[PDB]
Design an enzyme around this catalytic site. Structure first.
Site, PDB file in Angstrom:
ATOM      1  N   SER A  54       0.874  -1.181   0.000  1.00 20.38           N
ATOM      2  CA  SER A  54       0.000   0.000   0.000  1.00 20.38           C
ATOM      3  C   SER A  54       0.906   1.224   0.000  1.00 20.38           C
ATOM      4  O   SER A  54       1.716   1.359  -0.933  1.00 20.38           O
ATOM      5  CB  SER A  54      -0.997  -0.081   1.162  1.00 20.38           C
ATOM      6  N   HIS A  84      -7.119  -9.716   2.055  1.00 21.84           N
ATOM      7  CA  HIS A  84      -7.776 -10.173   3.282  1.00 21.84           C
ATOM      8  C   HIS A  84      -8.674 -11.371   3.009  1.00 21.84           C
ATOM      9  O   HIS A  84      -9.725 -11.541   3.642  1.00 21.84           O
ATOM     10  CB  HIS A  84      -8.556  -9.041   3.954  1.00 21.84           C
TER      11      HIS A  84
END
Lengths: 582, 594, 579
Positions: free
Chosen positions: B453, B568
């Site tokens: 990220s 996730h």
């Protein structure tokens, strides 16, 4: 608006009342809501029963079995063996399905079938096949010592075998006849069974026998009534255990049918039979017992089945019955064997009402003090229900059974019409101009027989009927023996076949004028549908008003899958036919 | 000891203390696919309570106020509300919705269970009557929710309309039980963690007032008669856990709880640790349970007890009840863990810190600079399976908290505002240089840089501004700040909050282009592994496709792994495939280049 | 009464006009009906009749005559079929596209991509060559000894591939297709451009001999092939050059919004063969005995012809009257440009719609456009032009926009539009819209970011960020290098690409904009449209974003017209809302 068949869907059905080993709890099965019935386990410790499992798919949970230490419940879930700890936590699956689980008394094993006999080792958490029978396994019980099990296995002739725990079954009794309800004696060597010895045909009352070193002695002496519940009622969904239980070394507790009732009694090794819990106006349909307590299911003609533990009712099922129940009145008739009895159930009010003669099946069963939703709903819809126990019925002694042997359509038919005539005399509210006759199985045979021997009825409803005794002998899964036992006639022999043709309602079908509803399952293995097809084709050829309902679901679909569709549709067709003809 | 080591782990979550303070119910996810079941402890070794053989399993345990029942959510059946009596018997399914439910909360008097179901509406389970009833259908949706202590109703956070929602601004409402919500606070800002005061009238929330940007530390506010005053004064650190770690699977409650009429218990991130503190109506913030080397990632509490999950850089998460550990999960960790060493660096705002995790032995080992995401989070004292596994495979792991990190005060956060790629990159390479000097065993000729990220943004930025690294791994990266603004599900606001720049305004777009790693991609010579999910809604895969295309055109060695499973995935479905495959690709790339 | 998008479902779409070897028959493909399926049709000189029928799948395509004229090979969904023409039903010869008979009738070559070989006499299949990179154009040598194949920065060469029991024949290192082996069995012609030329150079005709190349379509400053717009082309449109004799190579070429057939001579210049400047020949096949083609105009729906005689009745299916456009000119430093206005019936003022064609190196003009005819049938004046950058007006007209999209091309469009408003008084200067697809969507975005004059805009398959396109498009690696001389992976070039990006100027947009895009577009990724939408929405410009789950050309790909019908519905609803 009158109650309709849908009233059934308000009901929940109890079964399998299992008393805990310490005698202080009862665990049982409750089936409740095309709508569909599913079953879950319920538990009472003396008070109002509470649900213990919950099932939203499949048939649900059944066969609750206490572990000897009282801390767990084994059960079958849909099919898999489950173990539920009673003091907290959710069940675990320990195993084409399973059935008939039984803990060894020492708690070390669980036996079940899957059919071969299998063994779950509780301490080792392992499964092992115990025995793969060639023909099949009937009754089964553990010796009190947990050394193994007794098993029944094989013209309805069977023997009893000893099967020890694995490390081959040995024959323990040359019985060569009907046997079930194995009840091992506490001494680990003697055992009791329910059945009849080799020399007796199957119309003989089933009785209790003590077995010792291969000898048999009748145990329920001086009691001219059969062991087990053979009383009619339509609110029994699920398993109804009636295995005898030794209360001590001298006392064997069992149930027995007596004049439309079912009571608990005790047989003593040292003497005679005593009443234990026998209301002549009630039916105990299932029970379990040990040295500490008794659990059972009780009902009457006016009371829906309820579960009891040591004399206190733990269910509230009668409160779910959606319309008021009514109380029948007794009407007697005279025969050369003594007084016969039946009952009339009336609608509310004082106006004339149609009279429906209902004929129970068997023929060796009883009408009487079972709970019959169908009868209560007929009265709630304005019909008088007349139902009786003619000769051939089972609760009035062996002679009452034997009177019809070899000659169905004689004294049984007389008793039914004699009773019905007495109903019309005793009950002026019955409308002699609006009468119907109806029944299932032997009751359908009898409906077919009666309408071919009198035109007096304005409507007829024949369910699961028999019309051709010759063809039944070759098509029924019991055809090879049923007429030999019931009539002494062998359909494969010429002279006997002609006598069976003379007992066949189809021979007299040219006399039938009564509009007839025919109800039958297409896949019936006991009364093949060919029986109904012959009756239908004959009536239709004579242009008798006739309607033939062919169910794709076999009988007892509610018990088999939980679907009430067949029972709802059947009731709809009964009432539509009565509304059309009265 | 490879990535498969992960499959030995079981993941705890949702530590729920009982009302009497003497029990904890929690969620444990374990094995191939992870399913979760409920576990229970009364002080000793925790025992399983439910068993999940199909689906994702059971979660969200909630005690009935009388301590006799557990409500929970079951997936086998999308997400059905279940009611389990603890003293015997099986759970009962209480809702039959096609799309399932979430967020069950008992009223304090035990009469109701509030929950939401498909924007999702708020529903009400009437316990004594065994009936369901729709309570409130919000226009936009419901955020935080708590019952008033007298059970008269709930407080809910929600936006008023689409205008306010498009600002990510909400207010707080009073919603009484049905027989119409009134506004309790004109907040027009961020709010969650509603903590109604025992007096039944006041309440606390976590967030920030309207005038503050979204990079301001989340703080605690006491609300009374529409007024607000900050409650965690003199505490220059955010509420909540913002420390990195890769062993959090499931829900991690951190809602503040009143211990008495003056005392509110909360968690807060401080220099790579997360501790419990208490805020006082009449005073300052006190430490309650703060190990500077540990992380408390979730907790529940009442006047009678506290339950939590605790971990460190060397200890896998464990569940505790009133200070006593009730799980044995670290014992499942399949290889030995090592102790990090601290290495500091200088900045004009003061000294920053990071850590070096060394493998066994004394031979030279490659050095991996790992960059945490956020950027406003902390590395430090969370448990990171990936870091321990890199050291177990012979790599020195170097990981730090440059300016922009969250646990070192508001000024340390603010240092990077509007200028990502300046002091943050300086701090990272300065830290890394100090690692190489402090630990001669680190091989200055076999170095790699990697992050996810913002860490992927920074990996892209660093490799475009120095060729010093022998390998790079950029995960969930950002390469083009302009296109991100139009493609990201937060693109409309992220650059406004973090940089003061709006990609739809021309002058600002050029500044976003000058902050874009892609502008400098012609300088990249480092072999680069690119990892990205095809369906990423937060960092769209176009960010990675641009970096890949540029590197490929310059014939820089490059490998692009496109996962079809969103990030996730372990939490979403219990399938560890994406994590195993990611770790497999990381080590394969480092083995190839060192 | 007013026709809507549903009018499209009345149409049947012809493609692939294949003349028989004897020159006396044509076999072709017809797509018809909600879902389009294609079957083979046949004419022996008269009105065409159906030859195949299939009620499942997309249907039949690629009809190929056997050299003896007795069989038809074709592809059915996809498997190779052989249909005897004088009687009997088809046979499936493969149980697994681009089938091509050997000239001697012994083999059928196709791909499945690997190249495979069907032996007709032995009725067996065999893999011929499994390329690592891929196969482009393919043709049999006239002797049937083997095939010529094109295969590899978008650079390709030509190889010699004999029949099995590949050699390199030309180091071209550039774009090549349309292989046309010479009758002498040694030379061959190709369409493309030599190595030194960028892809904006007109495609031309080249004769190849012993590795040398010589341009064959000399003196003709126009590209080979059909590069004119029209929206009634569903299926394959063959344009391979064909030798009519040893000196004459027949080919098609785009000239000022028309497409005509011409002949190139080995010993001379280019002569017209069949070139109406107001019509478009979109596909053709030929041999020494006959010619079949598909022809259309701005007022005539595509029809199939055989040797000058029309054999289809497809224009009769058009469900409302077609209107005739009028030409309007504009002036530039390169000379006179042109465009057209299509007007509705009546004499009342009508809204003016500026439509911008894509490419950018294509032409508007004399193709048939159902969308335009339906816009006029619904009361809109359609204005459509060929600005510099268009392809049919010479190489200099193409080259004028090189490296600087958004300068003279934008000038020409607004100059053309202004000249429309002056020349056509019925056009309402107060109710104007601008719209286009692909490059036309780029230009709609660019223009609305540089003037507020339009009352509505519709941007389809648009481009807004030239930098991100370079990294996301499946042609991004080369497209800006060819079109602009700019490489997005280089810092100085990217800044120039940002200055050519419409998104840089989005702050000036005030025009309510309908954005249409496919979510799975690999050529213009949807991120291009997401950026325009998000920018307009932030500036609170009225904007609507239609995201199709079906990729472009769904009608051709699957026969489903849903995407085109929904697109037209959204266009007219947006125009109805704003005028």
């Amino acid at each position: 608006p009158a109650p309709g068949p849908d009233s059934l869907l308000a009901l929940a059905f109890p079964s399998d009342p299992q008393v805990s080993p310490d005698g202080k709890q009862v665990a049982f099965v409750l089936a409740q809501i095309r709508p569909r019935y599913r079953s879950g386990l319920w538990l009472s410790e003396g008070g109002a029963a509470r649900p213990l499992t919950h099932a939203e798919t499949g048939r649900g949970d059944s066969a609750p079995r206490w572990s000897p230490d009282g801390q767990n419940l084994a059960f079958v879930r849909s099919a898999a063996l489950m173990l539920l700890p009673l003091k907290g936590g959710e069940a675990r699956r320990v195993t084409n399905g399973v059935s008939g689980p039984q803990w060894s008394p020492d708690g070390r094993f669980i036996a079940f079938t899957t059919a071969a006999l299998w063994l779950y080792d509780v301490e080792a958490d392992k499964l092992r096949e115990w025995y793969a029978p060639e023909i099949g396994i009937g009754a089964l019980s553990w010796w009190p010592d947990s050394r193994g099990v007794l098993i029944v296995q094989s013209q309805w002739r069977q023997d009893v075998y000893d099967l020890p725990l694995p490390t081959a079954p040995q024959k323990l009794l040359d019985w060569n006849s009907a046997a079930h309800g194995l009840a091992p004696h506490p001494d680990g060597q003697r055992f009791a069974l329910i059945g009849r010895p080799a020399g007796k045909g199957n119309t003989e009352h089933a009785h209790l026998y003590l077995i010792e070193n291969g000898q048999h002695r009748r145990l329920d002496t001086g009691h001219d009534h059969p062991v087990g519940d053979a009383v009619g009622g339509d609110c029994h969904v699920g398993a109804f255990p009636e295995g005898p239980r030794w209360l001590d070394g001298d006392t064997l507790l069992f149930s027995s049918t007596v004049r439309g009732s079912v009571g608990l009694f005790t047989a003593h090794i040292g003497g005679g039979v005593k009443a234990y819990d026998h209301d002549p106006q009630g039916v105990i349909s299932a029970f379990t017992a040990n040295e500490h307590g008794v659990a059972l299911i009780r009902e009457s003609a006016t009371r829906f089945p309820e579960v009891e533990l040591n004399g206190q009712r733990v269910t509230d099922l009668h409160a779910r019955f959606p319309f008021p129940v009514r109380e029948p009145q007794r009407v007697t008739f005279e025969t050369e064997l003594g007084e016969g009895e039946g009952w009339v159930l009336l609608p509310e009010g004082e106006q004339k009402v149609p009279a429906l003669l209902n004929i129970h099946g068997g023929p060796h069963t009883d009408y009487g003090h079972g709970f019959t939703h169908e009868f209560q709903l007929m009265a709630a819809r304005g019909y008088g229900v007349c139902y009786s126990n003619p000769r051939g019925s089972v609760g009035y002694g062996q002679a009452w059974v034997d009177a019809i042997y070899g000659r169905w359509g004689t004294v049984d038919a007389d008793d039914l019409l004699n009773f019905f005539d007495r109903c019309l005399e005793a009950v002026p509210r019955l409308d002699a101009a609006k009468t119907a006759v109806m029944g299932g199985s032997y009751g359908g045979f009898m409906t077919n027989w009666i309408t071919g021997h009198t035109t007096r009825f304005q409507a007829a409803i024949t369910d699961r009927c028999i019309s051709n005794l010759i063809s039944f002998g070759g098509t029924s899964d019991i055809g090879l023996r049923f007429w030999d036992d019931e009539l002494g006639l062998d359909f494969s022999r010429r002279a006997d076949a002609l006598k069976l043709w003379d007992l066949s309602p189809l021979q007299y079908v040219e006399n039938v004028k009564t509009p007839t509803l025919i109800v039958h399952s297409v896949l019936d293995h006991r009364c093949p549908v060919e029986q109904a097809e012959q009756w239908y084709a004959a009536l239709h050829k004579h242009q008798v008003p006739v309607r033939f309902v062919r169910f794709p679901e076999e009988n007892h679909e509610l018990s088999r899958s939980g679907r009430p569709d067949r029972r709802l549709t059947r009731l709809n067709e009964y009432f539509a036919w009565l509304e059309r003809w009265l």
